[PDB]
Structure 1
């Protein structure tokens, strides 16, 4: 990062003995049949396989086609459900998935509020808004998860839900 790894994807649980050629042919055919290709020709340019640990990396011709291909997570290939993920070194830009948390009791401190949020997964940023003159909470906070796929799980699990006599609001910041 910040701009590395934008045209590669991790593929796990690949079928044993599968060749780089056959995997490339499979993925290129699915892109066409599923309507995910954005131009004539093949979106996947190359495949690299680690046979010992049963995983591959796909290399795409474009940034947007790499993003679209994530919709194939779970697809069954020769009896195996494939695990499709971003590369470890891929990171979205800072603040891309920032969340606003509203309707918190104002007597709770930072760590007590962080407890509710980290139950869904680790955070890479957090701030509980306070009155700087007195140090007292204003009842709302901002955060961002390390895994951006947890963002929607947190929204689903906490938005519109009861917390005391208050209802929580959890939504994307803006």
Structure 2
């Protein structure tokens, strides 16, 4: 396709964090192009993603899309698992739009957002073995019920899990079922702490 209109560029790019180690710009493009078409979120011929720039330190990427609306749609993939990792999809910090009718137009089945706001039933899960990737922890929690939001905390320099995560169930009543099923679980030198995150949050 043609080059993108320059005055919509800020509205045609997204930050993508927590990318897989060793990923190429081509592999990232192919993943997003395929997911958008498989989800019915692109119907026009041709690829919705024009380019991917992976930062020199290889921890995040910026994606550029051919249209403003497809960029907004791609926000709905926040949290999608790619090679075991929860992709963190966000607006560029210098994107300042737009009040009226910037949020994804349609939801993507099975994708769980990484944005976990503090709230009544937000859970903290601590003591997790650090060999478990984002996918496996998400699966541990999804056993109890579908998730609305989830993030596993990792070291920003090594990519290794720090052994704790946060989540929110779709059904608020699943919260207590997950606590009963996981809190106090013993794993060698570690014991899971599973409780509403408000109970132990720093002040």
In the superposition, the TM-score normalised over structure 1's length comes to 0.51
Paired residues in the alignment total 172
Question: Which whole-Å CA distance do the structure 2 matches of 1:78 and 1:172 have between them?
Answer: 29
Pair member with larger Rg: 1
- SS of 1:28's equivalent? helix
Q: Answer yes or no: is 1:13 the counterpart of 2:18.
A: yes
Counterpart for residue 33 of structure 1: 38
1:93 offset after TM fit, Å?
3.7
Higher relative contact order (CA 8 A, sep 6+): 1
Residue ranges of structure 2 left out of the alignment (5+ in a row): 6-10, 101-121, 199-203
Question: Which whole-Å CA distance do the structure 2 matches of 1:14 and 1:111 have between them?
Answer: 13
Per the alignment, do residues 150 and 53 of structure 1 end up closer, same or farther by CA in structure 2, a change over 3 Å counting? farther
In the superposition, the TM-score normalised over structure 2's length comes to 0.44
CA contact (8 A) 2:84 2:134 kept: no
Question: Which whole-Å CA distance do the structure 2 matches of 1:89 and 1:130 have between them?
Answer: 25
- SS of 1:9's equivalent? strand
Question: Which whole-Å CA distance do the structure 1 matches of 2:67 and 2:94 have between them?
Answer: 18
1:38 offset after TM fit, Å?
3.8
CA contact (8 A) 1:4 1:90 kept: no
- SS of 2:45's equivalent? coil
CA contact (8 A) 1:27 1:44 kept: yes
Residue ranges of structure 1 left out of the alignment (5+ in a row): none
Stretches (4+) displaced over 6 A: 1-5, 98-174
1:81 offset after TM fit, Å?
0.5
CA contact (8 A) 1:4 1:89 kept: no
Q: Answer yes or no: is 1:136 the counterpart of 2:141.
A: no
Per the alignment, do residues 138 and 92 of structure 1 end up closer, same or farther by CA in structure 2, a change over 3 Å counting? farther
CA contact (8 A) 2:78 2:87 kept: yes
- SS of 2:20's equivalent? coil
Any residues of structure 2 matched to 1:120-135 within 5 Å, and which?
none
